[PDB]
Scaffold this active site. Structure first.
Site, short mmCIF file in Angstrom:
data_model
loop_
_atom_site.label_atom_id
_atom_site.label_comp_id
_atom_site.label_asym_id
_atom_site.label_seq_id
_atom_site.Cartn_x
_atom_site.Cartn_y
_atom_site.Cartn_z
N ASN A 11 0.86 -1.18 0.00
CA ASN A 11 0.00 0.00 0.00
C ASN A 11 0.90 1.23 0.00
O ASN A 11 1.64 1.46 0.96
CB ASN A 11 -0.90 0.02 1.24
CG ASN A 11 -2.00 1.07 1.14
OD1 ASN A 11 -3.18 0.76 1.35
ND2 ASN A 11 -1.63 2.31 0.81
N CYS A 16 -5.83 3.27 -5.17
CA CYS A 16 -7.24 2.80 -5.30
C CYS A 16 -7.34 1.41 -5.87
O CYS A 16 -6.83 0.46 -5.31
CB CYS A 16 -8.10 3.69 -6.20
SG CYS A 16 -8.67 5.31 -5.46
N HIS A 249 -11.87 1.19 0.38
CA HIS A 249 -10.88 0.15 0.63
C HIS A 249 -11.15 -0.83 -0.50
O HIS A 249 -12.24 -1.41 -0.61
CB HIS A 249 -11.07 -0.56 1.98
CG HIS A 249 -10.11 -1.68 2.20
ND1 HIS A 249 -8.75 -1.52 2.07
CD2 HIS A 249 -10.31 -2.99 2.51
CE1 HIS A 249 -8.15 -2.68 2.30
NE2 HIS A 249 -9.08 -3.58 2.56
N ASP A 266 -5.74 -8.52 -0.03
CA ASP A 266 -5.92 -7.21 0.56
C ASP A 266 -4.53 -6.63 0.70
O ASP A 266 -3.86 -6.79 1.72
CB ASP A 266 -6.61 -7.34 1.92
CG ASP A 266 -7.16 -6.02 2.40
OD1 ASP A 266 -7.22 -5.08 1.58
OD2 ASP A 266 -7.55 -5.92 3.58
#
Length: 332
Positions: A11, A16, A249, A266
């Site tokens: 991240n 996005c 998220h 994730d």
């Protein structure tokens, strides 16, 4: 202390939807290999999108740690705080793929992009009173499906090909016959091996319930069907968003091998999950977690698209170049 068999991406901003798309493309094994075959040996590490995509894929294939993408974002020039917010996946995808499709021209792997994602369409117009019809074949690499007021992917497709009425102030410029009343609609000529379907949830963010199946039969929305290849698709990936318009998220669920065994990606965290968590749980509730893009692979193309990828499938000249960067950065 590790497990899943797959590694994640890091991240590093409001990329996005980017990370999800990267994983989605990486597990399109046939596409991955074609990328590794690109003549980037003379490219500039910090200006070449093709080379940047190779780097990520190599990393994703070998690394035991989350993969970065800074050289990738710098590559296509999306670096402002909200640069990814003012864009949608459909646009990111054309950026990457269009860059890779053009770099493969003149190679043994040229045209891999169209072979996988391009499909054929036909838009027509038929005048009610006067006899005049205009036909225009089209090419597409993805499909935008209307979701508001629809229950399942089937109605979205029903609505997509529905006939449109062109009347007073909508009247069609028939040239020699002047303005006229007529109908306009679309009909599918071909459906690609890899189907990129984007669910029109953003226009706002529509969180209504919308169902999509594991197995999707599209054979009926095609002009001519042809046995020996029914247009039956298998669910490969579900790109999910959680929350409202500018509250989010992004995550993606995939069953990489097409074997029905799913995982949740994730960002840097990758874990196993059930079919329900990947499919049913993402239909939308009466709660904002849901899917905005789906990827289906044709049942007859599954094997080739999901070709096993070996370490040897990466050109030694690429392997070394990437490996040197690791040393230069190790000596940091």
């Amino acid at each position: 202390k590790k497990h899943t068999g797959y590694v994640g991406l890091k991240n590093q901003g409001a990329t996005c939807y980017m990370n999800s798309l990267l994983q989605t493309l990486f597990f399109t094994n046939q596409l991955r290999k074609a990328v590794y075959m690109m003549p980037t040996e003379g490219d500039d590490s910090s200006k070449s999108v093709p080379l940047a995509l190779q780097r990520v894929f190599y990393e994703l294939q070998h690394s035991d740690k989350p993969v970065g993408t800074k050289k990738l974002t710098k590559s296509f020039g999306w670096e402002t705080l909200d640069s990814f917010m003012q864009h949608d996946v459909q646009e990111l995808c054309r950026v990457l793929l269009d860059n890779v499709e053009n770099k493969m021209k003149g190679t043994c792997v040229e045209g891999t992009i169209p072979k996988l994602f391009r499909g054929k369409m036909v838009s027509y117009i038929q005048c009610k009173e006067v006899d005049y019809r205009s036909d225009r074949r089209e090419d597409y690499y993805d499909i935008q499906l209307s979701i508001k007021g629809k229950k399942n992917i089937f109605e979205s497709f029903v609505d997509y090909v529905a006939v449109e009425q062109l009347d007073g102030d909508n009247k069609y410029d028939a040239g020699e016959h002047g303005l006229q009343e007529a109908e306009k609609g679309v009909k599918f000529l071909t459906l690609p091996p890899v189907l990129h379907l984007q669910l029109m949830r953003f226009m706002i963010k529509i969180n209504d319930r919308f169902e999509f199946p594991e197995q999707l039969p599209l054979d009926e929305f095609l002009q001519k069907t042809d046995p020996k290849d029914p247009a039956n698709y298998i669910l490969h990936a579900v790109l999910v968003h959680s929350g409202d318009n500018h509250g989010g998220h992004y995550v993606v669920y995939l069953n990489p091998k097409g074997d029905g065994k799913w995982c949740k990606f994730d960002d840097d965290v990758v874990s196993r999950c059930t079919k329900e968590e990947a499919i049913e749980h993402n239909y939308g509730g009466h709660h904002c977690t849901n899917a905005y893009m789906l990827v289906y692979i044709r049942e007859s193309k599954l094997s080739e698209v999901l070709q096993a990828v070996t370490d040897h499938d990466i050109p030694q000249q690429l392997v070394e170049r990437l490996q040197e960067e690791k040393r230069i950065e190790a000596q940091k």
